[PDB]
């Protein structure tokens, strides 16, 4: 038998965490040093997440109604003899263990998308001497490096860098910032105009050659297109691997199309044909790309089938009925495959889009199109 | 806030020992879960002194009063738990589908260290009977 001991007081610091096989394998990798990390945005409100170097889990505590005693081995200091009572099926003790902890819950981990806390990060519009402007505002948070930003954000390192590339993060005049859409794409257009001006291989772009191409004939003090800006554009509109960039040409063209929508066809719904002509003419010369509205599906809207007007999904309400209400105000008739990416983020359960709608709004089709008619 | 996971000690002990095969790891550790409430005395220091050596139910170990509160007899997968003079529990050793992990949150320094992994558990799901 095993002699059973209990401490009179358990340490509640010892807690139970579910370890999936993958978590265990990662855990059983001595190579990693600081690849696993408990992370949370704040101490009192936000959730606490578990992040590997490339994956993120959300924690869920789950209470149970049983008495669970954690024990580990101890060597009893003095020989003790047990009372043999009416004990049948009970042999001489051959180990003494003492319960040192008593846990009442388990911690479930569910894989989730790590996200950046973009609370105090300002928007950059291309102002010269921006370091002065960051001190014109009272932003106490200082972001020297991305690692510091990532550390106080609910996401993994790789997730953090990816999102950072996705949001076009940079640093200007020694102050980290995020470029406005207008100035970012304008800087992109001028950059591409230099890129065609210096005949660079768009599939094998590097930072130095591109930075040199932009700032070749302009003074550096009045050249806001710094190397960090170059790194941002490369990390946003190209993919790296030294590590070199190759342009995502249909993606860049799509961005350009969204930008075109925001500049020229946002306040008015032009017929698609003329806007595509001007749009096509808006590119820097000889840029190889064709066009289709599906490339901008989810970023524009069509009051009628042959016209287009810009819409940002970010401006749509979080609540389905409200979002559908404003969507139907924007376009009386929507195509199902066209309306899906505007509501995809609200599609959490992953099921058929029509069932998702049928809780709030209701569908009505036609021949090729399947539309939704909210009341 | 944020903090890294310390798993070096468990890893070094883990690498030199085999994967957990039975209910006890090569390092000698174990968990315990009971379907019920452990009715314990409200005090502990006082009752350890009336404890006689022959009974040895409330022993003193390294200046700490440990109670010998029951006995567990492990027979293969089967396990039986006698508690005190008046309780008997019949049970089983079950292997955890998901190897859980016990770790240690050093609240003082806000440091976390992975302590151990468990693959089996000793469960008693039936109402206790007298030891007779």
């Amino acid at each position: 038998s095993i002699n059973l001991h209990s401490a009179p007081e358990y340490d509640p610091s010892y807690k139970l965490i579910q370890l999936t096989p993958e978590l265990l394998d990662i855990i059983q990798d001595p190579v990693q040093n600081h690849q696993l990390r408990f992370k949370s945005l704040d101490k009192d409100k936000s959730e606490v997440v578990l992040c590997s170097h490339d994956k993120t889990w959300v924690l869920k505590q789950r209470k149970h109604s049983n008495t669970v005693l954690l024990m580990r081995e101890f060597v009893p200091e003095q020989p003790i003899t047990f009372d043999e009572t009416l004990l049948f099926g009970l042999s001489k003790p051959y180990m003494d263990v003492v319960g040192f902890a008593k846990t009442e819950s388990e911690f479930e981990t569910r894989e989730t998308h790590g996200e950046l806390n973009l609370n105090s990060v300002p928007i950059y519009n291309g102002e010269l001497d921006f370091s002065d402007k960051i001190m014109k505002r009272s932003s106490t948070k200082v972001i020297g490096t991305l690692e510091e930003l990532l550390e106080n954000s609910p996401c993994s390192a790789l997730e953090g860098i990816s999102k950072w590339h996705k949001i076009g993060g940079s640093v200007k005049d020694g102050v980290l910032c995020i470029l406005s859409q207008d100035f970012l794409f304008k800087a992109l257009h001028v950059l591409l105009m230099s890129a065609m001006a210096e005949s660079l291989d768009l599939q094998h772009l590097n930072v130095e050659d591109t930075h040199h191409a932009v700032g070749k004939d302009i003074e550096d003090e009045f050249n806001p297109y710094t190397r960090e800006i170059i790194e941002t554009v490369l990390n946003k509109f190209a993919v790296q691997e030294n590590n070199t960039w190759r342009l995502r040409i249909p993606f860049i063209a799509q961005w350009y199309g969204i930008q075109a929508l925001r500049k020229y066809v946002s306040g008015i719904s032009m017929p698609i044909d003329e806007f595509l002509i001007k749009w096509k003419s808006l590119f820097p010369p000889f840029f190889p790309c064709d066009i289709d509205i599906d490339m901008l599906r989810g970023y524009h809207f069509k009051p009628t089938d042959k016209t287009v007007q810009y819409i940002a999904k970010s401006t749509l309400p979080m609540d389905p009925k409200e979002r559908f209400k404003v969507l139907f105000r924007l376009q009386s008739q929507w195509d199902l495959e066209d309306i899906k990416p505007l509501i995809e983020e609200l599609n959490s359960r992953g099921m058929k889009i029509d069932s998702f709608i049928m809780k709030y709004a209701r569908r009505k089709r036609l021949g090729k199109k399947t539309v939704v008619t909210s009341r | 806030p944020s903090v890294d996971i310390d798993a070096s000690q468990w890893q070094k002990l883990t690498q030199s020992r085999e994967k957990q095969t039975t209910v006890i790891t090569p390092l000698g550790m174990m968990m315990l879960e009971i379907q019920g409430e452990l009715e314990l005395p409200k005090d502990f220091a006082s009752l350890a002194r009336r404890d006689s050596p022959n009974e040895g139910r409330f022993s003193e170990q390294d200046g700490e009063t440990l109670i010998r509160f029951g006995s567990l007899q492990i027979d293969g997968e089967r396990a039986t738990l006698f508690v005190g003079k008046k309780q008997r529990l019949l049970g089983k050793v079950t292997k955890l589908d998901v190897p859980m992990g016990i770790m240690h949150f050093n609240s003082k320094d806000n440091k976390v260290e992975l302590v151990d992994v468990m693959k089996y558990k000793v469960i008693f799901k039936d109402r206790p009977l007298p030891i007779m």
């Binding site: 101490k43 | 019920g36 949150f105």
Partner: peptide, 26 residues
Amino acid sequence: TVKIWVKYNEGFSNAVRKNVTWNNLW
């Protein structure tokens, strides 16, 4: 030295999943 025992829970219930804060831990 004879008043130590277990009050048996007839069954097993697992509670609702809960979110965890830093303060829940600390």
